[PDB]
């Protein structure tokens, strides 16, 4: 007769490198309202949230994790946002037998079952770009690839995964260059080696420096194909930087034709998911709960992943159905949920929600090409089903893709 309360211990980065809890906390709250008003899901339970601002800081998150674990009520799951906060909470959680579900972690390191045994994330790993990259090389018939990276762990881990993945496809990495901050020499050597198909991983500030150097070394043309990450700000190359000798026109010249990969986080289609909302309805509903515009809202685009995280948990808890008896000293309930979370399959606001063996989200990638200083969508790729959606909008000089070598 009485619905039993069941708790989530969440962490939202409202400040920091990713103030993603700004749109994710309301998205989580909306998702809890929707799940609790459904009688087909958890008729006997009420999902409640207890949260703190991680400030996207692990030292800060440590105070709150203690606050979450060492004060009543007992929490059945832990929900962190940042990769740096998830690396801390996911490794520690084992001692309290807690499932960790992240909505915003992209770190490939988090796909490590030994280190992070009870971890799942609705946010995919940065390595998801890699099956899309290999498929694009296969489509355009390239077997020789160059790689340039800023000296960051994310970029190191993503490139390590690319090496393994390219091999399974019969392709090889010709040259691998890295730089902490200044790309003058690696860009220099790329031209020396006559590298022709290049993948570059760096942040936006560094991409500008790479392209000025690419500007200086005549390393753009029909001969060259650059692959980049699709998450830079619009007109990232027209952005002014006092540390770049190159100009807007020159830079618009260099970036032209480059390919980008980015994770699809909102279903483009007008179909209705488990909540019975369309992608456009979710966006409209979320815009209303916000103090400010979606534009000045951090993690606005990761908000569907946060919404779908609550549904993934709800559906997993529904599959198990003795939740009030959970204790940090016991593995029994944890393992049943692990099993239930592991076999997740549903349509969410972000699309089809499924996790791989490592607890990492499987999703569609959007492929774009910079045409006339603007990105045009050339396709979408589904890694799990080898599905490639191709739109005949890709434009190449001389009517065709260049090649990995001299010919």
């Amino acid at each position: 007769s009485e619905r039993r309360a069941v708790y989530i211990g969440a962490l939202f980065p409202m400040s920091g490198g990713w103030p993603g809890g700004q749109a994710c906390q309301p998205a989580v709250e909306m998702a809890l309202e929707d799940v609790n008003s459904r009688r087909d899901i958890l008729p006997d339970y009420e999902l409640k949230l207890i949260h703190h601002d991680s400030k996207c800081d692990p030292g800060q998150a440590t105070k709150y994790l203690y606050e979450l674990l060492y004060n009543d009520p007992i929490k059945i799951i832990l929900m962190p946002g940042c990769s740096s906060v998830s690396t801390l909470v996911a490794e520690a959680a084992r001692m309290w037998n807690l499932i960790v579900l992240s909505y915003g972690s992209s770190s490939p390191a988090l796909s490590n079952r030994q280190r992070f045994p009870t971890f799942f994330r609705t946010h995919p790993s940065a390595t998801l770009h890699n099956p899309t990259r290999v498929k694009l090389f296969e489509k355009w018939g390239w077997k020789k690839i160059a790689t340039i990276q800023q000296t960051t762990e994310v970029f190191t881990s993503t490139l390590d995964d690319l090496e393994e993945r390219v091999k399974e496809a019969g392709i090889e990495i010709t040259f691998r260059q890295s730089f902490f901050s200044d790309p003058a020499v690696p860009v220099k050597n790329l031209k020396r080696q006559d590298a022709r198909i290049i993948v570059g991983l760096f942040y936006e500030t560094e991409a500008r420096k790479v392209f000025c150097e690419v500007y200086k070394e005549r390393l753009f043309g029909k001969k060259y194909v650059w692959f980049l990450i699709g998450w830079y700000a619009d007109n990232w190359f027209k952005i002014y930087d006092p540390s770049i000798n190159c100009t807007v026109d020159e830079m618009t010249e260099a970036v032209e034709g480059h390919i980008t990969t980015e994770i699809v986080m909102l279903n483009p289609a007008n179909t209705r998911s488990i909540s019975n909302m369309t992608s456009q309805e979710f966006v409209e509903k979320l815009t209303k709960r916000l103090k400010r515009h979606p534009e000045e809202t951090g993690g606005f685009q990761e908000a569907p992943l946060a919404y779908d995280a609550i549904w993934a948990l709800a559906l997993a808890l529904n599959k198990t159905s003795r939740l009030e008896d959970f204790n940090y000293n016991n593995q029994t309930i944890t393992d049943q949920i692990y099993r239930a979370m592991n076999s997740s399959s549903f349509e969410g606001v972000s699309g089809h929600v499924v996790f791989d063996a490592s607890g990492s989200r499987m999703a569609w990638t959007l492929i774009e090409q910079l045409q006339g200083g603007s990105y045009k969508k050339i396709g979408y790729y589904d890694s799990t089903k080898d599905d490639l959606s191709w739109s005949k909008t890709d434009k190449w000089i001389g009517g065709s893709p260049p090649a990995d070598d001299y010919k």
Partner: protein, 400 residues
């Protein structure tokens, strides 16, 4: 007699390899606590060190810290943190509970970042503390051109990165910078090819035997060469594939080892009234069956830092603890920054939470490493031991 509770965090279990550090230092900690108590230095209070096993594990270590806060007494400060990743987790969080931390074994340079670890202090010099020492050795022998050989592992690349800033603005050129992951031979051949004579090496014990074998094969040993490598390797480390033991020893001959000084060589009375030599005998008696640890002096002085800090903190409150008190945490933090006494490890002084200590120079002579000199970080001075240090030629090697 009210207690002054201190949270002791270190690996203590026999099942954990680094448990030997935690156990090896306890007799030294027992000696320091016992003396402070009898002498009633903190009268009416008494030092209450509570021990919690981290197990050299991130999750177990964090739970050990969390359980100490929940079920343990109201600790005024943290004493310990041995393993690098465990210490980084605890040290980063400190401000949350207004807890000042004093480590005696965590030597990772990462902890020097006061933006990330403001409340962290250490009596032990970091891995990077060898760099100002090496600078003085290079200036002493007029070596203006060096080559570097580093292993591609964070422990070694952190030290090589720090060397750049240490050698900047000084008349020392790094003519060749070489890195390796598994095999050093290619890098050693590049150093030979660029005519490098003075090599600054940063690699593990296992890689050192490979480095010296490549050095024999490339003839990068003898009167014309000087290898300056880590001094923290286990004794007889070389004895433990193409080279013969006699050829490895021929290439190893004359190498300079650099590491922190475990105890002061000065036969002068320390804060406890005992000389470092008198303390060493007292420690060796007290340890019994327990294996000694090079960090024992740092743990001993660590306890004296805490006592003196609590004394200054008691004075400051008299001049006018839930983890709630930002103010007392700031008083303890300001008191610890004032630390200046002669301990068993030499003069115990902090420069932005970092120990200004003593760096030991050793030279491999025929069968073992022999002490050849010491560097005083406080004074920025080097003292070479007369008639120890030797060279195969008539003069020390030339840099080109």
């Amino acid at each position: 007699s009210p207690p002054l509770s201190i949270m002791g965090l270190m690996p203590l279990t026999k099942e954990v390899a680094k448990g030997s550090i935690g156990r090896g230092v306890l007799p030294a900690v027992e000696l320091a606590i016992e003396q402070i108590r009898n002498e009633s230095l903190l009268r009416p209070y008494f030092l209450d060190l509570r021990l919690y096993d981290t197990e050299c594990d991130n999750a177990k270590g964090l739970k050990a810290f969390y359980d100490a806060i929940k079920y343990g007494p109201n600790h005024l400060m943290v004493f310990g943190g041995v393993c690098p990743s465990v210490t980084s987790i605890i040290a980063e969080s400190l401000q949350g509970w207004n807890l000042v931390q004093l480590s005696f074994a965590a030597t990772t340079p990462v902890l020097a970042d006061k933006k990330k670890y403001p409340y962290f202090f250490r009596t032990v010099p970091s891995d990077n503390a060898v760099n100002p020492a090496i600078l003085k050795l290079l200036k002493h022998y007029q070596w203006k051109r060096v080559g570097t050989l580093t292993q591609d592992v964070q422990r070694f690349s952190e030290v090589r990165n720090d060397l750049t800033g240490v050698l900047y603005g000084e008349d020392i050129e790094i003519s060749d910078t070489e890195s390796f992951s598994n095999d050093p031979c290619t890098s050693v051949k590049k150093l030979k090819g660029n005519d490098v004579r003075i090599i600054l090496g940063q690699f593990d014990q296992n890689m050192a035997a490979k480095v010296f074998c490549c050095a024999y094969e490339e003839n990068m040993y003898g009167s014309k060469y000087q290898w300056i490598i880590p001094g923290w390797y286990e004794p007889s480390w070389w004895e433990q594939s193409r080279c013969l033991r006699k050829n490895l020893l021929a290439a190893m001959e004359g190498y300079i080892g650099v590491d922190f000084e475990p105890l002061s060589s000065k036969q002068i009375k320390t804060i406890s009234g005992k000389t470092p030599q008198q303390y060493e005998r007292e420690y060796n008696n007290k340890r019994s069956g327990v294996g000694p640890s090079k960090f024992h002096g740092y743990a001993y002085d660590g306890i004296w830092v805490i006592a003196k800090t609590l004394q200054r903190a008691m004075e400051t409150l008299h001049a006018s603890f839930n983890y709630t008190d930002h103010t007392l945490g700031r008083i303890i933090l300001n008191a610890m920054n004032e630390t200046n006494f002669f301990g068993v490890t030499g003069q115990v002084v902090f420069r932005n939470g970092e120990r200004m200590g003593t760096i030991k120079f050793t030279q491999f002579q025929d069968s073992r490493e022999v002490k050849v000199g010491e560097y005083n970080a406080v004074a920025d001075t080097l003292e070479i031991i007369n008639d120890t240090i030797r060279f195969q030629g008539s003069e020390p090697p030339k840099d080109d």
